[PDB]
Design an enzyme around this catalytic site. Structure first.
Site, PDB file in Angstrom:
ATOM      1  N   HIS A  61       0.741  -1.131  -0.039  1.00  0.00           N
ATOM      2  CA  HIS A  61      -0.078  -0.070   0.046  1.00  0.00           C
ATOM      3  C   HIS A  61       0.898   1.155  -0.081  1.00  0.00           C
ATOM      4  CE1 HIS A  61      -0.505  -0.790   4.344  1.00  0.00           C
ATOM      5  NE2 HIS A  61      -0.772  -2.014   4.026  1.00  0.00           N
ATOM      6  N   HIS A  91       6.054   6.958   6.064  1.00  0.00           N
ATOM      7  CA  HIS A  91       5.732   6.391   4.945  1.00  0.00           C
ATOM      8  C   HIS A  91       4.939   7.919   4.186  1.00  0.00           C
ATOM      9  CE1 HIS A  91       1.841   6.335   7.287  1.00  0.00           C
ATOM     10  NE2 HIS A  91       1.274   6.411   6.266  1.00  0.00           N
ATOM     11  N   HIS A  93       1.983   9.106   1.028  1.00  0.00           N
ATOM     12  CA  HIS A  93       0.830   8.959   0.111  1.00  0.00           C
ATOM     13  C   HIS A  93       1.078   9.736  -1.102  1.00  0.00           C
ATOM     14  CE1 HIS A  93      -1.519   6.881   3.363  1.00  0.00           C
ATOM     15  NE2 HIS A  93      -0.687   7.434   4.160  1.00  0.00           N
ATOM     16  N   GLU A 103      -3.647  13.346   1.272  1.00  0.00           N
ATOM     17  CA  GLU A 103      -4.765  13.109   1.899  1.00  0.00           C
ATOM     18  C   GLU A 103      -5.403  14.237   2.570  1.00  0.00           C
ATOM     19  OE1 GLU A 103      -3.243   9.426   4.409  1.00  0.00           O
ATOM     20  OE2 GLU A 103      -4.358   8.515   2.749  1.00  0.00           O
ATOM     21  N   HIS A 116       3.639  11.124   6.519  1.00  0.00           N
ATOM     22  CA  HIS A 116       3.251  10.654   7.773  1.00  0.00           C
ATOM     23  C   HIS A 116       4.305   9.990   8.769  1.00  0.00           C
ATOM     24  CE1 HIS A 116      -0.987  10.463   6.225  1.00  0.00           C
ATOM     25  NE2 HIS A 116      -0.583  11.719   6.426  1.00  0.00           N
ATOM     26  N   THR A 195      -5.548   6.552   8.483  1.00  0.00           N
ATOM     27  CA  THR A 195      -6.107   6.749   7.209  1.00  0.00           C
ATOM     28  C   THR A 195      -6.186   5.579   6.413  1.00  0.00           C
ATOM     29  OG1 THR A 195      -4.307   7.432   5.742  1.00  0.00           O
ATOM     30  CG2 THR A 195      -5.281   9.146   7.228  1.00  0.00           C
ATOM     31  N   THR A 196      -5.791   4.486   6.435  1.00  0.00           N
ATOM     32  CA  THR A 196      -5.910   3.236   5.903  1.00  0.00           C
ATOM     33  C   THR A 196      -6.697   2.329   6.786  1.00  0.00           C
ATOM     34  OG1 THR A 196      -3.804   2.057   6.772  1.00  0.00           O
ATOM     35  CG2 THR A 196      -3.862   3.450   4.488  1.00  0.00           C
TER      36      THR A 196
HETATM   37  C1  OY0 Z   1      -3.356  -1.816  13.532  1.00  0.00           C
HETATM   38  C2  OY0 Z   1      -2.705  -1.063  12.336  1.00  0.00           C
HETATM   39  C3  OY0 Z   1      -1.836  -1.831  11.546  1.00  0.00           C
HETATM   40  C4  OY0 Z   1      -0.470  -1.346  11.089  1.00  0.00           C
HETATM   41  C5  OY0 Z   1      -0.336   0.005  10.980  1.00  0.00           C
HETATM   42  O1  OY0 Z   1       0.425   0.614  11.436  1.00  0.00           O
HETATM   43  N1  OY0 Z   1      -1.385   0.696  10.217  1.00  0.00           N
HETATM   44  C6  OY0 Z   1      -1.394   2.317   9.741  1.00  0.00           C
HETATM   45  C7  OY0 Z   1      -2.199   2.770   8.922  1.00  0.00           C
HETATM   46  C8  OY0 Z   1      -2.181   4.032   8.765  1.00  0.00           C
HETATM   47  C9  OY0 Z   1      -1.591   4.913   9.292  1.00  0.00           C
HETATM   48  S1  OY0 Z   1      -1.808   6.608   8.544  1.00  0.00           S
HETATM   49  N2  OY0 Z   1      -1.671   6.763   7.020  1.00  0.00           N
HETATM   50  O2  OY0 Z   1      -0.222   7.332   9.207  1.00  0.00           O
HETATM   51  O3  OY0 Z   1      -2.833   7.091   9.364  1.00  0.00           O
HETATM   52  C10 OY0 Z   1      -0.349   4.648  10.205  1.00  0.00           C
HETATM   53  C11 OY0 Z   1      -0.268   3.090  10.420  1.00  0.00           C
HETATM   54  C12 OY0 Z   1       0.507  -2.114   9.956  1.00  0.00           C
HETATM   55  C13 OY0 Z   1      -0.820  -2.982   9.231  1.00  0.00           C
HETATM   56  C14 OY0 Z   1       0.942  -3.176  10.742  1.00  0.00           C
HETATM   57  C15 OY0 Z   1       1.208  -1.340   9.301  1.00  0.00           C
HETATM   58 ZN    ZN Z   2      -0.254   7.586   6.154  1.00  0.00          ZN
END
Ligand code: OY0
Ligand code: ZN
EC number: 4.2.1.1
Length: 257
Positions: A61, A91, A93, A103, A116, A195-196
């Site tokens: 992703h 990471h 987007h 986002e 992020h 946000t995922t």
């Molecule tokens: C329960 C979480 C699962 C873990 C995770 O950290 N997901 C996640 C999703 C979105 C954002 S964002 N875009 O910063 O809001 C940051 C982290 C995983 C799937 C191991 C990576």
């Molecule tokens: Zn993110």
């Protein structure tokens, strides 16, 4: 499984993750004229001098640059936060085109990408426990616009060939995340979510007002990554962003006038 395509993208997520339609979802549009200056907000404290990066991973992703979060080495404090939040990964987007990819939006404006930096509240002991708490995470969001290169991003850009496809990882030690920050730490803040999927409502969002500039060549290299695994049909990893969600019963606060 969820993703960013027509058949498994943001409009579909609510069927597996009903919290997608919840009361504090992210991202949101930041209406700059409606955000309120909050003179009681403290300056952010970003303490990254002891950061220990370990690995970069294509997870299908996005790609995550992961850190050693087993001690207070790279921490965020202050601002709207009570307590100490440890950096676990960052990471991005990004879009298929320079006019989209972020986002969060700012007066409906979309940036080319969004960084992020994800941190978790040490009072909860580990990241998995923290995501189950309303004040479990603090994510520092930084917009990217296309212009001049960001030199501190180049080491990330140059390893991407080695993690082209889902499930690939590479050693990524001694990376300094301070090189990804803009000059100013002026920010907007509001309570929101991942946000995922699983879209958990555990995030204090801190979004910097000042974007960083990256070069056209740098973002072009992001767009050569793949959502798929090796030996599967090639699907370019582009447009891995969730659009703005309804603000609902929230007020965005600004650290600046
Ligand atoms: C329960 C979480 C699962 C873990 C995770 O950290 N997901 C996640 C999703 C979105 C954002 S964002 N875009 O910063 O809001 C940051 C982290 C995983 C799937 C191991 C990576
Ligand atoms: Zn993110």
């Amino acid at each position: 499984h969820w993703g960013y395509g027509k058949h498994n993208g943001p409009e579909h997520w609510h069927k597996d993750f009903p919290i997608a339609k919840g009361e504090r979802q992210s991202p949101v549009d930041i209406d700059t004229h409606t955000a309120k200056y909050d003179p009681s907000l403290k300056p952010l404290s970003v303490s990254y001098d002891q950061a220990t990066s370990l690995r970069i991973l294509n997870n299908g992703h996005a790609f995550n640059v992961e850190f050693d979060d087993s001690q207070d080495k790279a921490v965020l404090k202050g601002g709207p936060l009570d307590g100490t939040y440890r950096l676990i990964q960052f990471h991005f987007h990004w879009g298929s085109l320079d006019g989209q990819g972020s986002e969060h939006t700012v007066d409906k404006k979309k940036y080319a990408a969004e960084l992020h930096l994800v941190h978790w509240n040490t009072k909860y002991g580990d990241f998995g426990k923290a995501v189950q708490q309303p004040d479990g995470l603090a994510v520092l969001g930084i917009f990217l616009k296309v212009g001049s290169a960001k030199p501190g991003l180049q080491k990330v850009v140059d390893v991407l060939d080695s993690i082209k496809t889902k499930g690939k990882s590479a050693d990524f030690t001694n990376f300094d995340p301070r090189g990804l920050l803009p000059e100013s730490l002026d920010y907007w803040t509001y309570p929101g979510s991942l946000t995922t999927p699983p879209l958990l409502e555990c995030v204090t969002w801190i979004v910097l007002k000042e974007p960083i500039s990256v070069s056209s060549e740098q973002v072009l290299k992001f767009r050569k990554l793949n959502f798929n695994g090796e030996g599967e049909p090639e699907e370019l990893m582009v447009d891995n962003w969730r659009p703005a969600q309804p603000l609902k019963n929230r007020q965005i606060k600004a650290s600046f006038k």
